[PDB]
Scaffold this motif. Structure first.
Motif, PDB file in Angstrom:
ATOM      1  N   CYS A   7      13.372   3.535 -81.506  1.00  0.00           N
ATOM      2  CA  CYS A   7      12.107   3.961 -80.917  1.00  0.00           C
ATOM      3  C   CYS A   7      12.186   4.040 -79.390  1.00  0.00           C
ATOM      4  CB  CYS A   7      11.026   2.969 -81.346  1.00  0.00           C
ATOM      5  SG  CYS A   7       9.452   3.181 -80.505  1.00  0.00           S
ATOM      6  N   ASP A  10       5.325   3.491 -79.120  1.00  0.00           N
ATOM      7  CA  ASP A  10       4.289   3.705 -80.137  1.00  0.00           C
ATOM      8  C   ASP A  10       4.249   5.156 -80.650  1.00  0.00           C
ATOM      9  OD1 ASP A  10       3.401   3.073 -77.220  1.00  0.00           O
ATOM     10  OD2 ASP A  10       2.443   4.968 -77.889  1.00  0.00           O
ATOM     11  N   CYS A  13       7.329   5.816 -82.548  1.00  0.00           N
ATOM     12  CA  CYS A  13       7.097   5.169 -83.847  1.00  0.00           C
ATOM     13  C   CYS A  13       6.374   6.156 -84.779  1.00  0.00           C
ATOM     14  CB  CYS A  13       6.247   3.896 -83.666  1.00  0.00           C
ATOM     15  SG  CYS A  13       6.674   2.338 -84.498  1.00  0.00           S
ATOM     16  N   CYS A  23       6.147  -0.582 -81.681  1.00  0.00           N
ATOM     17  CA  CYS A  23       7.580  -0.799 -81.504  1.00  0.00           C
ATOM     18  C   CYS A  23       7.803  -2.141 -80.822  1.00  0.00           C
ATOM     19  CB  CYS A  23       8.235   0.333 -80.701  1.00  0.00           C
ATOM     20  SG  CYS A  23       8.145   1.938 -81.514  1.00  0.00           S
ATOM     21  N   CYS A  28      11.024   0.714 -83.942  1.00  0.00           N
ATOM     22  CA  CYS A  28       9.743   0.905 -84.602  1.00  0.00           C
ATOM     23  C   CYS A  28       9.561  -0.129 -85.710  1.00  0.00           C
ATOM     24  CB  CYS A  28       9.646   2.329 -85.153  1.00  0.00           C
ATOM     25  SG  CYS A  28       8.082   2.686 -85.974  1.00  0.00           S
TER      26      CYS A  28
END
Length: 31
Positions: A7, A10, A13, A23, A28
């Motif tokens: 990741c 976010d 993710c 994350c 993630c």
């Protein structure tokens, strides 16, 4: 494991697995 789906954020993710999961350690949280 501080290792999972690679990741950035976010949003990233979300990019793999939607719904903006978090994350941690730049991985993630989603399986």
């Amino acid at each position: 494991t501080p290792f999972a789906i690679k990741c950035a954020t976010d949003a990233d993710c979300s990019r793999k697995c939607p719904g903006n999961p978090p994350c941690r350690n730049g991985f993630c949280a989603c399986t």
